[PDB]
Design a protein around this ligand. Sequence first.
Ligand SMILES: *[C@@H]1O[C@H](CO)[C@@H](O)[C@H](O)[C@H]1NC(C)=O
Lengths: 48, 49
Amino acid sequence: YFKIYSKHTPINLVRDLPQGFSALEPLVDLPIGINITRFQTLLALHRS
Amino acid sequence: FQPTYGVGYQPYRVVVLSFELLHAPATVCGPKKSTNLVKNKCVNFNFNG
Ligand SMILES: *[C@@H]1O[C@H](CO)[C@@H](O)[C@H](O)[C@H]1NC(C)=O
């Protein structure tokens, strides 16, 4: 089972993580059934 | 194939459904039937397992 929990929070702090409490709601459970040992973030470029 | 052929030579469309169970969570489930809801009585309830 792949559990994805997520939370959207409106913050106004410039640099670091804000200090507070926010419990993450369960968003989606995925029937993947696969081995995962490594991950990588995907970003987006800005072209001009 | 021709429409005037015998029944042993006429074209037959065949669909074979293959059902396998693997160690991954099974997601193609049947449509579980739902009994109408009855309130205010001592009943045996089965809600989502
Ligand atoms: C999952 O992958 C890791 C790293 O490749 C491996 O050591 C481990 O034995 C694998 N587990 C299964 C159940 O295949």
